[PDB]
């Protein structure tokens, strides 16, 4: 029952097809991480192309034993406290509703019965593929626009089904990004443009590994595709732990600190500046 940082990546250019649905509201794509420290190295964002994601109305402010949420009679009642849209899985939007991050509204249950059934405010459904190439304004990374690209190893059953890419220090991200870089047939299939593919960033030094720890571990485990999920799971646990203790930040406000010393502060800052939320799951 764990504490995630939910990172907000703002859509920088709203696709035509979503302009009617969105209506001058700020839209953010949202992703859950355990490693806010790593957000200095975002190169892209990852989405499941066949995944179905909702455009979910959300509270502008959150109030961060157990937790509150709010219900309203109708869509029109929320427009006061809610001028914000999050793209995410329906599943994860329900979790956010039950922690007070999105509004609920009075729905009536299907069928013969009267029973009150709380619903989120979905403005529409969208497939991931329809968002590939979308520019996002990402917090902390010095590339400051980054793009949505496809990753086929994403589970819709976890987080929001949309994920951050730090190929410098995430084996999954290294692997999915290398699959894009080295498979021209795959680029052509998703109309991937060369300018959407940004290089890894040097952000975290680990004694004996340097600044591309994910690439070295992928090699050491012999990870050949983003689909090698036993090896990736294992390697993800290794890098996590290794970087927690031995990793040194070489970027941003807290450069020169060990990650175990800076992680909390970095996370506090993200929540305080509005770049992220706490999300339990």
Numbering used by the authors: 255 to 318, 325 to 541
Reproduce the article's own wording on this structure.
Despite predicted flexibility, the three insertions are, in fact, ordered and include well-defined secondary structure elements. Iax3 consists of a β-tongue structure which connects the α-helix (αae1) and the third β-sheet (βae3) of I2ae. Interestingly, Iax3 has a well-defined β-sheet in the apo-structure, whereas all the holo-structures show a significantly different conformation with shifts of up to 8.9 Å. Another difference between the apo- and holo-structures is the position of helices α1 and α2 adjacent to I4ae at the editing site, which needs to open (∼1.5 Å) to accommodate ligands. Overall, the CmLeuRS insertions are 25 to 45 Å distant from the editing site and thus are presumably not directly involved in posttransfer editing, although we cannot exclude this possibility in the context of the full-length protein and tRNA.
